[model samples]
Target: EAKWLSLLGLAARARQLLTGEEQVVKAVQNGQVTLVILSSDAGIHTKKKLLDKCGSYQIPVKVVGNRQMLGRAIGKHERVVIGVKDAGFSRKLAALIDE
Candidate 1:
């Protein structure tokens, strides 16, 4: 789990950098995306947009089925963007996020 300070920073950056779904699409295209968690209830347009982006980048995405499941996995609601480095830090993050 992230400390409050770090989470705050991440949240702020996410809001700023990925203000729109399309910006996240750009992130994937640039290989800056490490993981994607999608809400099953999200609009079709949003899901398709992300799918196309991930497909173009050859990035693997995990569909958590629904918002409730995603919320549990993330320990919060409305969290649909997570970008991190694909290395030891990412492994640690995956483990902590899973916990």
Candidate 2:
């Protein structure tokens, strides 16, 4: 399995993940999320909003896998995007996703 997704599984178990576009933006705006996970094929508007907001806040954003891939990692249907609140998990996940 991809190393990053495995970490996402544990992050889900840790309950530090927030799913959805609007929810992620809210958390990023409130600084509740440490890093963001985006699907590879996200919609234009949705992707634009996240990039705009997360960029303004300097929140780390990782676009990897896809909706189905992320959804399965978190045991949901389709988490088009997600947010990680834990600093440690976010750091590690970012590094893993980079590769």
What tens-digit string does per-residue lDDT give for candidate 1 at 39-61?
56767887787777777776554
Question: Which residue pairs of candidate 1 clash?
Answer: none
Model 1 TM-score relative to the real fold: 0.54
Q: TM-scores across all candidates?
A: 0.54, 0.96
Error of 2 at 73 (Å): 0.4
Query: Model 2, range 1-99, lDDT digits (tens) per residue?
Result: 788888899999999999988888999989799999889889888888888888999998877788988999988878788999999999999988886
* Top candidate, metric TM-score: 2
Off by over 4 Å in 1: 1-20, 72-75, 81-99
For every model in order, what is the number of clashing pairs?
A: 0, 0
Q: What TM-score does model 2 achieve against the real structure?
A: 0.96
Candidate 2 Cα outliers beyond 4 Å, as residue runs:
none
Clashes of 1: 0
Clashes in model 2: which pairs? none
lDDT of 2 at 47: 84
Indicate which candidate wins on lDDT.
2
